[model samples]
Structure formats: structure tokens, C-alpha cells
Target: EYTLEKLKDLQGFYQKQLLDDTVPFWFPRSIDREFGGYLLMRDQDGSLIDDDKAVWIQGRAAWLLSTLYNTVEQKQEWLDGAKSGIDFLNRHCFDTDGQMFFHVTRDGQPIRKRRYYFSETFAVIANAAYAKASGDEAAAKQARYLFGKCIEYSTNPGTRPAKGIGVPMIMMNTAQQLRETIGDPRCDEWIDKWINEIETYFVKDDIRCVMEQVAPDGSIIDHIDGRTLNPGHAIEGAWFILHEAKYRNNDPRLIKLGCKMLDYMWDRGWDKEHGGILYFRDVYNKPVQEYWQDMKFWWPHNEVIIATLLAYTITGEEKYAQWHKLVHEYAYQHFHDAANGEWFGYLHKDGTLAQTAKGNLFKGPFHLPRQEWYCMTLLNEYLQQS
Candidate 1:
């Protein structure tokens, strides 16, 4: 029952939601006109719940605005929004040691700094994206500088004794984004390195599972941190790899590998009794130590939607299409609020609402909106081919 008309309708639905509902839900309210960066602390109904700013969201929001300005539309508002964040970041996001802060006050004072360097990773893409939209070479230069620092921190044995899949996965996507913006050959080189690193360390070919953490020598750790498996993270990484494969003119090996990752992750993550994706699982099928292991989260389903549709289009397999439909139906029926603007972030195991709020510290406009954008673009291209 997957027909051209159905595909078209799905495309339209996502496109409308992105442009009309999601974008409007965050724009005027989230944009901190008096302050420099975005104010993302909002309630379920998009109300201003708090004034404290998550520094990661500042970068992510800037990247979103800059990306939209460059790709979707050339609106002055988008450009202004991006510039405001860029200004805020340049003014107060980092410390003297060149590492970015994880949290900040409303007026751009640093509040907290996490042990990890993910804030810098997000800042790289934000600067690169804003550089593209604003034609500011300084922003691009800053991005490259941040990129070098991150690579040094990640690879230096003295700095990081262990490796995580998150570093490689995020570095690949950020490199891809920077490549699109700056046309740097170094980005390509790093993209290859990170992709290989992800395959080398995180992807367990024998068990058909991707581990979140591993020893420096690419061996699994025996502890809980090493034993953790996040299906959503693996599935999300699969699509990132698949997109990289397509970017390299459809490299067959990477394409096949990406497909394998998606298949393995979907089988592991999907709730057989329930209709949604579980948040976490153990590699040996034992009880996960995390209390939220069985709860269904919104972002995993979003990632699987992109992965399944991309798999269906690339392979032309009916099963992939069916997989996409199952995820699409479950996500739309449960996570999405038809009466509201955006999606609910958390859900119970039995598909009831676990938390009725929208944006939070970890959740923002990135995954769901990116899903809609990618689905619209991919489906439109497929329709064109048809």
C-alpha cells in the first residue's frame, strides 16, 4: 500500500508541520531579543518556564536558523536569529582555556561546564553554519580552530583514556555539515577518520551491536558503561553513515554497512509488545541498570523514521517501507500532538504520555524538525524520480 500518492501526502504532512507548526512554535518566544542567544527553557505549551540557558541549545538553535537560512529560505529573520546567537557565542560562551561552557545565565554568563567536549562539538557546527549563511570568514575560521582543538582532545591518549561512539558519530555529522558550508578537504579527511573510528571501536560486528563506549584498543569494557547499548544512538549513527555514503557518490561498502547497522538496531530496539522504540537495552539481554531503559522516547522513533525511509528508497525493499510505515504511524499517533504544536519528548512503555512537556535540556528543535526536513526532501526526490 505504499503508493506515490501516499508518499506525496506524507511529504506534505511533514513539510507543513516543519514550516507552520514547529518553526512557529519556537521563533518569537525562543529568540532572546534583549539578550544575545536563544532562550530555550520553555514548558509543554511553549511558555517561558525558566530563564537559565543551556549553552548547547544556543549553538543548536543558531545552527538551525543558519541552516534554514541557507537551504530552506533566505529570510532576514533567520539570518538575524543566527547572528544574534553568533554574537552571544563570541561574547560569552567560552572560557580562557578555549573550551565551551555547557550552561550559561540569561545575560550570557557561564554557569556550568561538563567534563565532556560536546559543547565544543556543537559550537563547531554552529559557527560553520552561520559562516555559510552570513558569509563571514571569521566564523568559518573559528569553526576550523574549534575542530582542531576537538580532534586533539579526542585523539590524545593523555586526554581521553577511553573512546565513545558519541564522539565519532557527532564528529562525522559535524564534519559533513562543515564540508557543505566551507568546502574544506580537511573536513572530508576527518569525516573518513571518524567513520572508520566508529566502525573500528563502537560497531561490534560479531554481536551485531553498536556499543556506546569501548576501551582505547576498541575492545568492549566489562563494566556497565561499556555494556550499555543505545538503540536510538546506533540507529541515528546508521543514518549519518548512510548519508555520508550517499555524499561520497554511493559507496557500496558503506551503504551495505549502514544498512546492516540499521537492521540490527531496529531489531534490537523496537518494542515487540508495545508499538514504540525502547530507550536503552543491555548487550546480553540482561536487565539494564538505567531506570528509564524500557521507556519510549521521542527521538529514537524520529531517527528510525529517517533510517527506514532512507533504507526503503536506497534498497527499494517492501519491508523497509513497511518498517517506515510502522514507525511513522506509531510516532504520529502517539508522540505528536495534533492539538498542540510540537511533539512530546517522553512516553510510557504502554504508549501513554510519560511527560507532557515539550523542549527540555536534552530535547530541542533538532531531531524532530530535522526528521521532517529530511523526509520531505527525500520523498520529494523519490517522487521526482518516479
Candidate 2:
């Protein structure tokens, strides 16, 4: 009420009505209460694609509920939803090998133990949320364990993956978790190392840009499997690093790099000729990966919108606000399906509806909810100062 009355009122409608609909609509817990876990569907409107459950969604569900509990209200329903998700995850996701499965059948049978980093990242965020809300050190410790697991699988010299996606954007997420949970010195020390290594490899200062993937020792991997300069992902990562730099301080160059990253990456991704961003483009030829490569997924737009808003907030840069407006306008125009309860996952490059689905492997509760949650929280926080 204070935020709505005293400062910014635009977001009040969303937090009250538009936002809650997206959560309760797409990811309903009504059926899962009886059978345990979720039924995998292609989209909110479509028939069941598989009875199989995804590990990503379970962890994401836990996170969504935990964050919702904190942000929306201290409702017991939100806590209960998170508890249900955490229970489902603990019961179904873990395998005999002490690693979580990526996919499982609806009957709670394991399907695949995928590239471990992704699963661990999901679990880390989930437990981190739990820790934040509950103040349970055990929950925080579990988050720490998940962080260790991710490091074990992804980048540890001791137990590294034989082959993996380099710097796949989630490393930046890890850096953020470190900042929030463990604090600096120990965690921050590790963050600087990660950033430096990433800068040497993925964060290309020479080109005033960042790449998608790179070798362990800081070199670009150029193969289809190798090339990983997801423009949107890199832009998101830049904002994280920029946030880090602000706290770490004294370096204007760091902020300058952040500005350069925002400007350059947006130029590469956002369809200035049309609107929104291209999903998968080869950094070399600029050809997209698939026929629908030009199609923009919701998550990247989500990230860029957040990044631009954060940039505006941090530097008082007017251009960042303009960028934020462009992205936010384009995203809300295309992604929100007003007739439907939630957003569409896929869209054409020029920002038309490619589909109306809300449930996919990549399309889950995490990105959009987190984006909206962050936007609402950040804007509200800013409003307090104003």
C-alpha cells in the first residue's frame, strides 16, 4: 500500500491481480495434491505431452512458492505449496548415485540424469529461497551443498565434466547466490576468480562484448556445441557482474564495461528493425539455429528487461530507462496473453505469437516469476527512496 500510494502506482495493479493469475493459472497444484508431483504438459491449453515429470519444474516450483511466500504475503498456502514441491523433489529427484535425475516418469521413475549443473542450479535456488524465508541454517547448508554439486559437475579441477557448455549463463546466477547467502571475502573471493576467468574467456573486452561459451582456461569454443554467445544470456550475466562491481567498488571501468555490454549485446539481439530479440543466432553468420531461430523466447526478454531497469536504477542513465521501456513494452505486448491467464513461451522474431503454451522443459515457473518478482521488488525498493 505504501509503495502504491507514496511512489510508483503502475505495478500495484499487477501485484494485486495480473501477477497472481500467472502463478495460480499455469502451475496449479490442485491435481498434484492427490497423485504427487506434476503431470508434464506441452502447454497450458494442450493435452498432456508426457506423464513424465521434469526435475527442473519441481525445484522451480519450490523456488516459486518460497519467493512468492516472501513477496506476496506470509500466506500459509504459499508455504504449503513450497513444502509440496520440496517434498516431491526430495522423494523423486535424487538417484542412487547421489545426483538428481533430470527427467522422471509421472509414476516417479527416473528417466535421465542430465548434465548435472542444471539440476544442481535449480536445487540451489530452491534451497536458497527456503533458507531466506525460513532462516533455517540446514536449508542454507543444503543450498551450499547444491552449490558444491554444481561446481563439482561444471568447473572443478578435481571433478570436471569431460565436455560441457561453457559459462552457460548460470554461472552468473551462482555468483548472485554467493553474494546473498554466504556474503563476501570467501564467496566474493571465488566470485572475482570466476569473473576474471570468465572475462578472459567469455567476457570479451577486446570486442566490448561477451561470448556464450568458452574453454576452461579462457578461450572461445567455436563449434556448434562450442559456440555459446547467447546474446540475451550474456546481457543478463553483464548485469550480474555490474551489480557485483557496484558493491566491490572504486572501478568506473567496471561500470563502463557494464554499459558497453548492455549496449552491444542489445544491438546484437533486440530486433531494432522489428521488435523483441532473436532467440538463437550464430554469432558468426547471424543465421539462426532453426527455422524459428528468429523467434524470441520469453526468458531472454525477461532478463534484458530486468537488466535495463537495473541499469537505469544504478547509474541514473536515461538511455537505460529508454532501453528498459522498449524491452518492457515489446515483452508485455507479445508475451502476455490477456484472454489466457499467463504468458506465451514462444514468439516470432518480430514479436508475434508463435505459440500459446506455458509449460515446456525450458518454459517453466522460474524465469518469468523471478523477473516479475524482481521487477516488483526492485521498483518498490526504489520507490521507498523516491
Candidate 3:
């Protein structure tokens, strides 16, 4: 069990770095003060980059602020912030076909309409999270509806399934949400399905690394997927496995996998020669199938933080504690900008800022908020357990 002092220290670190600097700096003000809703994109120096918004980010920001309201009740502005984001996501993000588009103009014009599956997943996850925090029944029902839609799509064999070999992010996220909102049998079903599918197809037991993609027939697509070792993704998956393992009390197997994953992926991707994590690396010494492959992102650092802490908590392993200290030190030393608040989105091999943009089309409230959430809740629980 964690000592009160240790938990408090963790909380203090999170509040100082993440809550005070990152979350508030980029999104505190209402984007359109007169028109309403949060702005879509902001730069690294905290300047407005493109006023045009991505629907995905809108959903994510709303979900995050609402989470803040629920957890940090003293911050009433967070609730108002969540409301603003939700309004934008609902009003301008949704297409005429009732499908949420991938991108939208700042004034609320729809741009690229993706398949119904991706948007619905975000909407459902966000709505469910918000409803729980805000106590809105309609939001809850819609969350349920949207989640059901994903399940429907998943079961359909045709174009409904995602194109790549990577398991849908939503599948794991939505399942976790459903399990949290409603209780077992149904919850257990989702949990089981997710675990089985991931183990059977995605995770390479021999390498202890997560494959970038795998064919449905269980064929590993190494050429396209070969240079696919992702440290951050492995770290995220590690935590999910740890969460389930703790919840079920079923197996030490998952517990072992969780820690082992960190060791395996870090060997491949976490940068040690200088500092900071490598974004993408060849798992098998192959060229990255996609260009722009060398970028190291901020989210993976966040995931490693979660994984190390969770591992430390669950096993009280000194190794995990050491790992936590190492990664946190590296990230704060490299990714964090002391002159400005929040982290640089990406970093170069030499540890320079990869880009100056803060809120991009793809990056937004989700990763940082999730980091805060994991850190806060984990610390709270650890204190209680002690």
C-alpha cells in the first residue's frame, strides 16, 4: 500500500504540472466568447492556430471538462467549459445524416464526414462520461444508443469494421465505459470479448509487443505492420490490462503481462541514448510503412506515466517505482516548456520541440485529461488503501 505522504506528493506533482499548466492554459477561455463553444486549435505558445475545429476534439474537450467538474467540484468554470464544448460538438459537428463529421469549420460547418463508427464511438464515450458527471438522463440514453451502434458495426463483417489491423480504440474504451455505467454479465461479456480478441490477434506473446495490425485470419502483417512498435500504445494497453486484472482478481497472468509489456516496448522505443521517448520504431528493423514515421509525441509519455504508476501500485514493485521516476524525470526535463505552460506536442531526436501547435486536428483534451484522471484517481485510491 502507498503511504499518505507518497500519494500526496503524487497529487501535488500532477496538480502542478498537468492541472495548473496544461489543462487550464490551452482551454480555460471560451473559444468563441460571444458565439460560444471552445476553440478548435491552439498553438504551442498558446496562440489560436486554426479557428476551425475537429469534431473529435470537441467531443474530447467536453468529456474532459465534465470529468473535471465531477472530480474537482470546486472548479465550477469547468462545468461551464464542458457545456460550451458539448454545445459545439452537438450543433456544428453533426452532419445532416445525423452522423458526426471528422472536421468542421469554426463557425460550425461540416467538412469531412467519416464512417459513422468512429464519430459515434467518441460521442457515446463522451456522452456517457458527461452524463455520469452531470446527471443528465438524455445524455446517458444517447451514450447507450451510440455504444450499441458500435457493437452493431463491430458484428457486421463488411465495410463496418475498421480498415487497419489495429483493434479499434473505441472497442476497448466503449467496453470499459459500458462496464462502468452498467454492471456485469454484459460488462463481463465486453471485457471477455476484448481480452480474447486482443490476445488472439494483436498481442505477440513471443515478442511481448503489440502488433500494429493483424489480419482477421490471424496473419501478422509485418511489412506494413513491422515497423509498428509503439511504446505509448503498449503502455496504454498495459494499464488497461492492469485495471482489469485488479478488478477481477482472477489472474496473475495479466499482472505479469502488464509489467512485461513495459519492459519489452521500452527496449524497442523509449529513448535512452539521450532522453525522451521515441514515437515510432522498427519492431523488426524494417522501414516504417508510412512516411513522417520518426515523430515522438507527447501522449506516449503520458501513457508510460500511467503504466509505471499503475504497476507500482498493483505490485509494489521497486522496479516499477524506479521506472516511474525515470520516465517522469525525462518527460519533465524534455517535453515540458517552463517558459510556457503545457508540453510541446512532439519532440525531435535531439529533444527539441517537434511542433509549436497545442490543440491540433488530432491532438486535444483527451490524452492530458486522461493522464490527470489516472494520476488523480490512482493517488486517491492508494491513499485510501494505505
Candidate 4:
């Protein structure tokens, strides 16, 4: 349904959203003047609800700003903003043992640290992007050094009988970001291994669904927890693979693998009665105990929008074009707040606003801004080539 002109329009639309709506909502206001990083927990109108900062958003916002400086424009503000976070993260977020904290006070005092190293993963991307954007040799070395620590965190983990899709899916993007921005020898081979892990375990070709978690041997756990499908999460992985494929002259095998994930998850996640991608699903078509399972979240739509659009650009597929149209329309119509700018974080099943807050511990400048930036970048490259 989307013509070449339509694709061009879509690309510009995302570009404008990032520059005008999404990025403006978080910048100047979210940048912490007294604190070194950012104050991101805000209400719908960019009002600060909490002074506390989430370490994840610090890195994510820095990465976004640096990426803008690198790819979008050489804006001095973007580079300065990125340095705020890079300095904050390097100075305060880490513990004595080298692992990063999950939450901190506004003045860079650590509050909590989680079992996993996601904090470090985001830091890796932020540092790498800032290094590339600012030509900071110290930051580049920090990026590469944090990457090795991330490996230590991943390698040293002990686990339950079942494994979840999150680790490999997240690592794909993290590794991709680090590899592209700063050279790391381990990134390429590890990315392949994680891709293999997802294909061999998380993807269920027989049932045409991706599992959130499965037995170590890739068998379904069948419990409610195991049967739950995070369709959006898997779709994020889809685009990550497609990104790798795009980097490699559109490798046919990687394209197929990524497309299969998008196809399967789209079937499972896209709400039939409603307009947005649902938060969760049961693989066996059973009841979901999570009260928010049917809700429409901003992040999922962001993931699908990227996956479908990336798929379309790579393969010239009409199927992904239509899919992209559906999710893009739904997301812009429901979540987007024109009067206030940016978007609402959560919505009901029927597309009503669930709450007014735009920034939270889990939600920040990352998913939505990244989607807009990436889709614009993808279209620019595709359009230039044609």
C-alpha cells in the first residue's frame, strides 16, 4: 500500500517527530543541571515527578544524543548533552567491583544494583557512540573496556532450568551498537552465537511462535510463565538481525531469519480486535494472568514499527510495508500527544490513555527516539541508493 513517495513521507514524518516532538520533550528539561546525568522520571507535560534517575536512561539518552550528533547533525548541544551522561556514568554509576548500578540519586549517589549487567550494556553503547561523535580516545577505550566487563557479567551468570529470550535479544542490539561505534573483536563472533542461540532455542518453527522462556534443551515449559510470549521483544531481535544483514550486503540467510521472526511475532502480537500490538500473549491460546497482557504499550509499537520498516527496506516486501502501516498508524494515533508533545507511555486495550507520565524508570528517550532516528536513517539510505 505504500509507494516510494509514501515511504519518503514516512521517513520524513519520523525525522520530524524525533527532532520536534520526541527529542524536545526530553532535552533541556530532562538534562540535570545540578546533577551530572539526567533527570528523566517526568509527567506527561515534561514536569519532573521524581528527582531520582534511572542509570539505564542515562546511557540511553547519551547514546541518542551522540547518535544525533554523529548521523543527524553536528549540533553542539547534542555533543554537550552526551558528555554530561558519559561523564556521569564513568564517574558515578559503577561499583567497586566494576558492575553498574540500576538506580541512583540525582547527585550521582547509587541506590540499587540488579543481578544482571544491562546497566553496563547501555553504558557500552553510550560510551561508544560518544566516543565516535566526540573523537574521545578515553571514551573509546572505556567503551571497549566496559564491553569486556559486559562479557564477564554474561559469562559468569548461573541460571535456572529455563532460559529467556531477553538476554540474547538485548545482547544483539548492545553488541551491534558497540561493534559499529567502537571496534571490538568479540562482538562479531558473539553476535553470531547469540543469533544461533535464539534460532535454536527461542524460535519455535513448529508452532510458528517465539517463546519468552524455554527449557535448557529448548522444550516448552508449558506453565503460564513459560508459555507467555513477549512478541515485541522478539520483534526487536528481528530488526537487530535485519540490521546485521543490512550491514552485510543484505545476506539472504540473515534476512530470512529476521523476517521469519517478524512474521511469526506479528501474527501473535498484533491485536485483531484493537489497533496496537498487545503487551503479551499465551502461546497455546490460553488465559494470561498478567492484568496488563492486553494493554498497548509504547515500546512494543516502537519495536514493530522498526522491524516492519526495516524488513520492508531490506527485502522490498509489500507484506512488511502493510504491517508497518498498521502499527505506525496505530501508534501515532493513540500514543502520540500533539498538545503536550512526545507520547504517553501506556494505553488501555481500546487505545485510551492509561496514564499521563511520559518518563519512568523503564521508559525514557530510548525506544521511541531510536525508532524515529533509525527509520529515518534507513529510509535515507534506501532512497539514496534508489
Candidate 5:
């Protein structure tokens, strides 16, 4: 499966899906010319459902556009579209206290705020990517400043929820983008910090599970919902670590760590009979507290698709290739809305449609497009060498 022919075939599939099917569903149409940002709330037919905005998705949409501009093509529209997201984030997302909001109106009025700094981290990626694309020094400066604030938020976490894997995992990828796009001196050091924390606190080598949250002392939280494990999230973290390995000339320690994380989570997440990634699982195989634990969500499969393929490219292991094919086929088969473009956001555990909305407060163009884009570019780079 690692043959050049096989690799090239996969690359073409990823590139075509990304450029033709996935991205076109969101762009030009979603761009809010009347407002500073995007109008992303849409239905299954890719028509506007709600005019409200999710600040997280707004920043992410900007990152996707600038990334497309920087890597795929230098189209003027992509640059301007990215700038739209960047400007909206700066103008309306921030409150008077220098904190970012979690939700806003279509024209960028404050609507809601969260206790966490995730909105801040997502803002960093958008700011960094747009700065790189447009050579906006001020955007780069804001990105760096926001990066530090995110670091501070994590450290203090004065009023926060239970400790979970997402904060560290996202910060690693966030810093990575800042480093690659605008040369953040803090990126390397902080990436290492989060990766190590992920390994130390979340991954349970004895049970072969990578947990989502843990007590501050790194023990299983033991409560019902507290013990919940999001295997796709952990698997995504695995690929992030593996990416650093390839970035650093195949750093063997990271490969071993990443593969271990992937191996453990695959055992946990893959739905063997259903042929898709399960949404959640309990740490001890007991009843999961979340009602949707057995259902399927679209985004995590995107992470698994990238995770499995990248693992195969890195280690040349037959298992990773097989795993890649399994989730790849599963996602493309069930979640993909081939006729309408993009993907359906939810399905029952048996692979039936559960919802019709394509964009919402949480769902948008980020995960699916990112997977296809990353897979296409990664395969292209690996093929160049091989």
C-alpha cells in the first residue's frame, strides 16, 4: 500500500475531494460581504439556516481560507475571504476586558462568552495564517500576543472545567501553525510542553486507553462522565505528535510515542460492526453517561482519517494502512453528502443520517477540509522523496 502508485492514487483522491467537493461547499457562499466575518450557519442543502455566528468557527474558517491561499493557490478571493474573517475576529469577537467571545451575532455583536480560552487559541491560528498570507505585521503581532494570553489562561485557569486533552492538544497544533506561518519563538518550546503533558497525564499505558480528562494528579477522575474517553480526540493528538516526528527528521522517540497513542486509541474508537468511529466511550467499558456516546459524529473521523494515513506514511506499517482504509471508507461512505457537497454532521450508530444541518455553532469547514488538505499535501511531499 506504500507503493508509489498506491500513494499517488490516494493523493489524487484527497486533492480532488478537497479542492472540488469540500471547500467549494463553504467558500464564496459563506463569505459575509455585508458583515466583517462569515455567515456559516447553514442547512443540508448548503443554504443559510441561521444568521448567527460561532466565534470559534469564524476564526477557524479564516485559518482555512488563508491556508488555502498560502498552499493551494494565490487567488485574490481567498486572501480577501481570509481577511474578512480576520477583521471580524478583531472587531467584534473581543470584549472590553481583552477576552474573546464564544458566540456573536451575524454582524459581529457580542452574544455569549465561555469560561475557557479556546476562542483565544482559534483566534491565534486565524491571525497567524492571515498574516502569513497578507504580510500583515500587525496580524502577526496580535497572533503572538494572543498566543501568550492562551498560555497564561492555561496556567492560571482561575475558573475552568475539568482538565481535558483538548486544551493541550489544540495548543500544540495552534503553536505549530504560528511557528510555521509567522515564526513564533514560543512555538517549539510550547509544542514540546503540551505533547509531553498529553503523554504524561492522558495516556494510560497499563489499560491501553488514552483518556480525555484526568484528575490534576494524573489519576483517572473515576466519576461517570469524568471517566469518559474520546478516542478520536486522542487519536488526533497521536497524529499531531507524529507530525512533529516527521518535522524533526523522524524523531524516533516521537514516532514510538505517537504510534503507541494511535494504537491504543484505535482499539478504543473504531466501531467494528458499524464501520465508523464511535463518538465516546467510558474508561472501564461501563455505561457511558453521554446519551450520544454510541452515535457517530463527522469531525472525529476526519482526525482518524489523517491519523491513520499519516501513521502509515511514517512507519510503513501494514496495520496503519489497513486502519486508514477502514475509517477512510467508512467516513466517505456514510458522512459524505456527495450530491450536495461537504458532509453530514451526524448519524445513528447504524450509519443512518441523524441530522440535516451542515453548519452550526460547532460544525463548519475546518475538520473535513483540513484532513483532505493535510493528506493531499503530506502524500505529495512523501511521494516527492520516495
Candidate 6:
């Protein structure tokens, strides 16, 4: 069933969507000529619905464009688009205290700043990718500087009261991106450190769960935050580990760990009746207090699709290939809007559309397009090896 011809066709599908539909749907509409940054609050049909911008969306868009330019093609439009965002972020995304703002006005003024430093994390990777695309050492330096700040804030007791899985996960990803452009020997060391931190702190082998929050000493906190599990994030984190293993010449132990985490989280997240992944779950099989626990989100399915295919490619396992087909079928059948160019963000548990708008303050050009890009590239590699 999964032949070389099938892999080639699937790769072409993903590549075409990324190049023709997804990127074109976001461009020009997302680009702001008056403002240096992007306006990401677009409706499903690629219309601007809001003028206010989320700073991380701007960074994400920049990263997407720059990464495409570096890896996909040397398109001038993509390079210029990324430069516009980098300039805009440099002018307006940060505060006087050196922390990044969460939201900004269309004219590059601050709106709100979250306690967590995810904006800075996004900016660091954005700049690193832009540096690789544009051959700018200054942006690479800024990325390293911001990464240092993130590390400093992460360890400072005043900044982080409780450690969440996001910090280390994002740190590993940022370091991996930075290693491509910064050319620092220490980047690999940081990647290994962050991966070890994730394994030691968040991953629980006994419970077969990757928790979202834990105490600094790696103890369960026994509260709501501690009990929460984000299967999407756990699955996404598994692929990140698998990717690192691939980069490190396919370390067998790390590959097994990645596959194990993916299997455990897939069982926790997958909706057996509805055919899509759930948003949240409790670690102990209890009901989740979060109201959106049973809902299906667009991003998790994207992660699972990529993860499944990557697992199959790395190990030649039929089960992961079956999972890839299962998720691909469910996601395309439910989340995709053929009438429109992009996917709907939210869906009900019964596989109905819950939200129509494509881009918002929290969601933007990152997840789906990244999935397409990653799948396309990985599938190409698989076909080549065959």
C-alpha cells in the first residue's frame, strides 16, 4: 500500500500546497506596506479581520518565510518578507526592560506582554533563520543574545515559579535552528542539555505520560497544573527529539525513546470514536477541568501527521505508516475547508467545524504550513532512499 509511487505522490501534494496555496494565501494580505511587520489576523478567505498583531505571530511568519527561502528556494519575495518582519520586531516587539511583548499595534506599539518569554523564544529562532537566508551576522548575534536572556530568565527564581515543559522544548528547537546559522559549537551542547532536561524533568516512564508541568526538582505537584497533560505538545516534543536523533546519525536509544513517547501520547490523545486528536487529558484518567478538553484542534493533528510519517521513515515500521494514513484521513476530512484556501482552526469532538477564522491572535502561519513543509521534505527523503 505504501509504495514509492505513493510516497512521491504524497510528497508532491504537500509541496504543492505549501508553495501554491498556503504561502500565497498568507502573502500580500499578511504583508503590511505601511508597517514593517505582518498583520496576521486574517479570515479564512485571506482577508484582514483585525489590525492588532500578536508579536509571536510576526516572528513566526518571519521564521516561516526565512526558512522557506533558506531550504525550499531562494525567492526574493520570501527574503524581503522576512526582512520586513525582522525590522518591525527590532523596532517595536520588545519593552524597555528587554522582555518581548506578546502583542503590538499595527503601527508597532506594545499592547500586552505575557509572563512567559515565548515571544523571545520565537524571535530568537526567527532571527536565526533570517540570518541564514539573508547572510546577516548581526541577526545571528542578536539570536544568540536573546537565547542567553531566555536561559537567564528560565533559571531565575523570580521569573519562573514553576517549570513548564514549554521552556525547555522551545529552547531545544531554538538551539537547533540557531545551530544552522550561528555556527557556534556550543549550540549542540545546549541542544543536548535541553533534551536531557526534558527527559529528566517532564517525561515520566512509570506513568507513561509526558506531563506539562512539574516542580523544579522533578516532583509531581499534585495540583491542577501538575495533573494537566497536553498530548499535542507531547507528540510535537517527540518529533523534535526524533529530529535531533536523526541529526545525530540516528542514535538507536534516542530513536526508541522518541517512538515510545509518541506511542504513549498517541494513545492518550487519539479519539477512538471520533477519529481526531483531543486537545487535553488528565494524567490519571480523570475529567479535565479545562472546558476545551474534548475539542479537536488543527495543530495537534498536524503534529501527529508529521510525527507518524517521520517515525515510519526512520524505522520502516508499518504501524507508524498506518497511523500516518489514519491521521491524514481524519485531518483532511474534518479540518480542511476545500471551499476555502486554509484550514479551520477548531473542530468539535464529533468532527464538525467549530471556528471558521483561519488566523487569530494565538494561531497563525506556523503550524499547518510547517507541517506541510516538513512532511514534503521528509517524504522526499523517503522516496530518494527507496
Best-matching candidate per lDDT? 5
Tens digit of per-residue lDDT, candidate 2, span 1-386: 12235326645644643366667664454337764766535565545555567888878777777777766777777777676666677777888878888888776788888754577777887777767767767667878777766666655533332232244357556657655744323466566666666555665666655666556565655666455356777777777767776666525766776777778788778777788877765656444455666778888898897788777777887788778878887888888766755678887766777766677666766677777777777777777777
Give the alpha carbon lDDT tens digit for every residue of 1-386 in model 5.
65789889999999999998988898888898898788888898988999999999999999999999999999999999999999898888899999999999988888899988889998999999999999999999999999999998888863324678999998899988998898878789889889889989888899998988887878887778678888888988999999999889999999999999999988888888977889899888888878999999998899998988998988889999999888888889998887898899999999999889999999998999999999999999989987
Cα TM-score of candidate 5:
0.98
Stretches of candidate 5 exceeding 4 Å from the true structure? 158-162
TM-score of each: 0.96, 0.86, 0.90, 0.97, 0.98, 0.96
lDDT, candidate 4, 255-315, per-residue tens: 9999999999999898889878999999998999999999999999999999999998888
Model 6 per-residue lDDT at 226: 76
10 residues in a row with least lDDT, candidate 6: 154-163
Q: lDDT scores for all predictions?
A: 0.86, 0.69, 0.71, 0.89, 0.90, 0.87
Which tens-of-lDDT digit does each residue in 138-254 have in candidate 6? 898998898888878877735445678887788888888888765656678778787888889888889888889988899887777678899989999899999998989999877
Question: Which regions of candidate 1 fall more than 4 Å away from where they truly are?
Answer: 157-161
Give one digit per residue, the lDDT tens place, for model 1 in 1-386. Answer: 67888888999998999999888888856888898788877777777777878888888888988988888899999899988988898899888887788888999888798888888888889999999898899999999988888888878734446677888888888888888887666788888888888887888878988888888898877766567789989999999988988888879888888898998888899899987888998888877899999998999999999999998877787988999999999998998887768888888999999877787678887888889988988888889989
Candidate 4 lDDT for residue 212? 87
State how far residue 31 of model 4 sits from its true place (Å).
1.3
Clashes of 6: 0
Report lDDT (Cα) of residue 175, candidate 5: 88
By the TM-score metric, which is better: model 4 or model 6?
Answer: 4
Question: By descending TM-score, how would the candidates be arranged?
Answer: 5, 4, 6, 1, 3, 2
Model 6 gets an lDDT of 0.87
CA error at residue 105 for candidate 5, angstroms: 1.0
Higher-scoring candidate on TM-score, 3 or 6? 6
